[PDB]
Amino acid sequence: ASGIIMDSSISKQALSEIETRHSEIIKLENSIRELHD
Amino acid sequence: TRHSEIIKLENSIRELHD
Amino acid sequence: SGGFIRRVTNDARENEMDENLE
Amino acid sequence: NSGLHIIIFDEIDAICKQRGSMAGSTGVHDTVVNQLLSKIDGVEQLNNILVIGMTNRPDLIDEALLRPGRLEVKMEIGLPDEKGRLQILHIHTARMRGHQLLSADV
């Protein structure tokens, strides 16, 4: 009964979903800053 | 739902400005 | 209108954000 | 005009065994040797390095590594003889003899 072995591993970047689009909220702050001005 | 809320906020802001 | 941020990232950072906007 | 860089492998017979002996043991044990060989002396040339290796079983290391130009100076360190033993015993009893902690009948 030959046995006792090993292995190697790899990975994958699964969080492909973009996030930059929802982070460009600056313009709304600019408009409300103008309102407060 | 994004479009409705964003456009509503823009309309309110523009009306307030004018 | 039921939310403002698409929770693609999950995590708490999004949740609070949404509420504030509302 | 560059300085000098020193590398000290320890127990080099643990990652540098003969190629094709165990199918690289799932591959890594062969690519490691190939990378090391290609790096010590390759198409590009270096002239400011020095590699020192130690081992107790010197007939297992890959032959393509123990050639002139890669590891030239091979040395064997063995048990000493009477004069060597006297010198070794002299080295390790200097501090005592300095401060008079050693009896005069030794």
The answer for residues whose C-beta is within 8 angstroms of residue D36's C-beta and 6 or more apart is: D16, D65
Q: For this experimental structure, what is the resolution in angstroms? A: 3.5
Q: In sequence order, which ranges of A1-37 are alpha helices (DSSP H)? A: 26-36
CB contact under 8 A, A31 and B16: no
C9 contacts in A (CB within 8 Å)?
A: 15, 17, 19
CB contact under 8 A, A31 and B13: yes
Question: Is the separation of the CB atoms in D52 and D6 below 8 Å?
Answer: yes
Q: How close B6 comes to chain A (CA, Å)? A: 10
Chains touching chain A through at least 3 C-beta pairs below 8 angstroms are B, C, D
The answer for residues whose C-beta is within 8 angstroms of residue D96's C-beta and 6 or more apart is: D102
Q: How far apart, in Å, are the Cα atoms of D58 and each of B10, D10, D14, D51?
A: 79, 13, 11, 16
CB contact under 8 A, A8 and D28: yes
β-sheet bridge partners, residue D50: D6
Helices and strands (H and E) in chain C: how many: 1, 0
User: How many whole angstroms from its chain centre is CA A28?
Assistant: 23
State which approach was used to obtain the coordinates.
Answer: cryo-EM
Q: How close A7 comes to chain D (CA, Å)? A: 7
The answer for residues whose C-beta is within 8 angstroms of residue D58's C-beta and 6 or more apart is: D13, D74
